[PDB]
Design a protein around this nucleic acid. Structure first.
Ligand SMILES: [Cl-]
Ligand SMILES: [Cl-]
Ligand SMILES: [Cl-]
Ligand SMILES: [Mg+2]
Ligand SMILES: [Mg+2]
Ligand SMILES: [Mg+2]
Lengths: 144, 144, 144, 143, 144, 144, 144, 53
RNA sequence: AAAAA
RNA sequence: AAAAA
RNA sequence: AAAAAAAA
RNA sequence: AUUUUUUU
RNA sequence: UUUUU
RNA sequence: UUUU
RNA sequence: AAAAAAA
RNA sequence: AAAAAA
RNA sequence: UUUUUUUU
RNA sequence: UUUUUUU
RNA sequence: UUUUU
RNA sequence: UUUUU
């Protein structure tokens, strides 16, 4: 291979874009309370802690969830997801339970292509229900 | 296969080196505080406990971590890693969380070929962040 | 190839060993007197000059010898080796002579697998006989 | 059909009333914190293993497993340092558990050149651990 | 092959048996009287002289008998075997005679799979008849 | 073929050894008593009767035994062998008997490679038991 | 292979020989004077220094020679070999000269099969002529 | 210690270069050794990120 | 899908 | 798979 | 062959 | 195809 | 070839 | 089979 | 026709 | 070759 | 792919 | 008949 | 899929 | 399946 710099015969000025797009999976936690649904805000996806504070819209592709803390005594962990959309909220409750009390509960849902539009900070991704006090979210989305 | 000593028709004196190189991965532990990142010194790789007290430089290739103690109550173990380089520190935070509260949390990162230079004891390998008070590291490196 | 750091999906904590083994070819010299057999000590292999000051035993596999100085006047260089073992010394005298007064003499022997046990510093490897006053030894062994 | 038959035996054969025996011997040893315990070979010769008639043995491999729980907040670990009469080793083959409730395991194989006999007074390996009763399984050849 | 010790990546604790079975060929001699059949006790198999004093039961597979001393004057050696069982003794007399007066007489019998149960020291294997004062026995059996 | 002397275009002085090894099969006899075991000394291998008084050590590979004299009256010849090793003696009593009173008894054993080390005159190779007063031994060994 | 002793089902007593033959290559030196031919005695082959003091005859096959010391000033080394036989000496002078003043001069000759009879110590192998004061000889022979 | 500046000289047509990427080094003994000795030579790689041993 | 490893 | 030119 | 890091 | 029986 | 299962 |  | 082999 | 999903 | 190896 | 490094 | 060719 | 070959 090359051990020194080499010359590039660059031609015309190309098409450029100083602010491109970025497909990412954003790991962040949300605080969930017993017998209560938490509307996950899209604004949690725009932050300097994920390098996405320069974005104002994002296209969510798939959401996954894991329980972040231990379940109540004598109970196993569970976590539910209800997809939310501006054109109409869903009533599905994708539930995933843990078969071991010491192990996390996990579940996720994929957003179809016909429902993959941009979402701003004031929007919400989904509702979360769990017997645990905190839920770890990993959202695969496209920032633009 | 032979049962007796046999002669070796040796020739000219060969090329020798009394202090060769060594490809190792060093297991050693560090103490971590809550909400604080601990810088892993390179001088931990040089010790008589690893037969590496004769070296002064080392070329690190990959680092991996495990939580050495139990996490706080109601928490799952996690561990983060931020690679550091003398030419420029990274801002990455490769995190690994445990799905079982009784299980370690593991994560690692690989150093590319273009960044595999030597490091002396005063240098640092990476920062570590974890809710556990100790972390076990296995640093695959090349002592020279 | 790659140009930046990449995450490693590490798993369970592996089997580690801080003090491993090491197959080495150790070069060192011995001062020999004319007509007198010099017993080469095993303690000469364990030295910080060879990065082997952390070992206490070694499994010798093959021994090779070269005359380090010029022979007496009107003579050619020669060097002999008699293998020694804690279970019974041998009487072989593997000799190598030089066909040139300016050139080194060389000879070597291989220890059979059945006789490849450990040796501590207080032991001896073999006896050397030569008309030259110094002999260079290159010993292929396995430190443990 | 399902009844006895006769064997047309020939000359008297070569016999050996006390032959060899390749075995895997499970036993446990008590270990202290921060102290290395020397495992005696004499623990392999016992009526609990049908080996009280043997006086020597050729060891091939050693494997260890912690038998009791580690200290609080700690994970289990176990180290093995091979020992030989021709020269002790300095390796510390260590194995740790990724779960506090799970044993820590590690082992080492003896090469086909250091496989000589060892009597009861001989030692096989040093053991370090944070648990108090690590268990051992040793594959060896009694003779 | 390897000249040093290697690491064994052991896993979970296996299944163990400190007291295993043993298929053996037990050689022992019994004294026989003229015109009198001798019941071979099974307890002859359990002995420290066979490394079998730790067993209390054995499954006999076959029995082979050789004459151990010389026959009377002018006669050739012979030996008979009558298998004995707890469910029902046999009346077979497997006889082997010697064609040379100076040569042992040999005979044996095999126990079928349907008759291969355990026996204790109080039981008897077979009856031995011979014109020689002593008979050697090599019993192939499974200790358990 | 050639019928006269032929010139040899010799080159450099080669590697030499005036005292090499020797793979041999050494026969001798030992006097044995009744019921008592006789430890066979290794020093019997080093004698001018076998061209071996120049060796001090030897690597034994296999031992075989025969009964050298006639057995007691009415008995058949037998001979046992128990291997001895400096690291640890064996308890195996390899035994072979004679099916003819006028015929010798024979038995032997082979030493594994891992147990093939050197033995000096002060060492013992095996024990011998027989009902005959003398035993003939043939030992395959590698003198060094 | 095997890790323990195994039984050898030996048969009848074989054919043995305590003092076998030995095909050897014997190295030794002889002093030679300038202009004088030195007869090499066969008795030099029989020595304890070669493990051959138990032989009284030998069948010589081939003889090679090397100059053991440096030649006179300005001269190159040479060495001549005139074969000798009890039935009749030869007049050949197999000579080899060195193309470097610092290197040895080598030559040799092979004895045909028809001339490979035994030779006792009182006989002579060949005459040697050289300008150096010592000559090294390697004799491939068959001691019997 | 072999200086890198020895590589920049008009005797090598290289006095216009201020930097250089070294790939391999080879050495030979230029003068005769002391009496009764054989020549030897050792090389110890040095780097700005860390000296070898 | 004979024994032990 | 072992030796001794 | 070689303990260590990896790996359908 | 390591050991102990059975094995042409 | 020579010496060894 | 002997040679360089 | 310039760096490390050319089998 | 990155980041993500299969 | 780092250190020792095996018939010019 | 191996190939890899700037005109 | 964007970027850089 | 033993016997006898
Ligand atoms: Cl260094
Ligand atoms: Cl040296
Ligand atoms: Cl030969
Ligand atoms: Mg030369
Ligand atoms: Mg335990
Ligand atoms: Mg020189």
């Amino acid at each position: 291979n090359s051990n020194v710099v080499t010359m590039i015969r660059a031609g015309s000025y190309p098409k450029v874009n100083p602010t491109p797009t970025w497909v990412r999976a954003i790991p962040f936690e949300v605080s969930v309370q017993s017998g209560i649904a938490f509307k996950v805000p899209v604004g949690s996806l725009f932050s300097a802690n994920f390098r996405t504070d320069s974005f104002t819209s994002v296209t969510v592709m798939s959401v996954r969830a894991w329980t972040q803390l231990t379940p109540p005594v004598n109970e196993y962990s569970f976590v539910r997801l209800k997809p939310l959309f501006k054109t109409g909220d869903s009533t599905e409750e994708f539930e995933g339970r843990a078969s071991n009390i010491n192990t996390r509960a996990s579940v996720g849902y994929r957003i179809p292509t016909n429902l993959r539009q941009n979402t701003v900070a004031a929007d919400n991704v989904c509702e979360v229900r769990s017997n645990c006090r905190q839920v770890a979210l990993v959202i695969s989305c496209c920032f633009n």
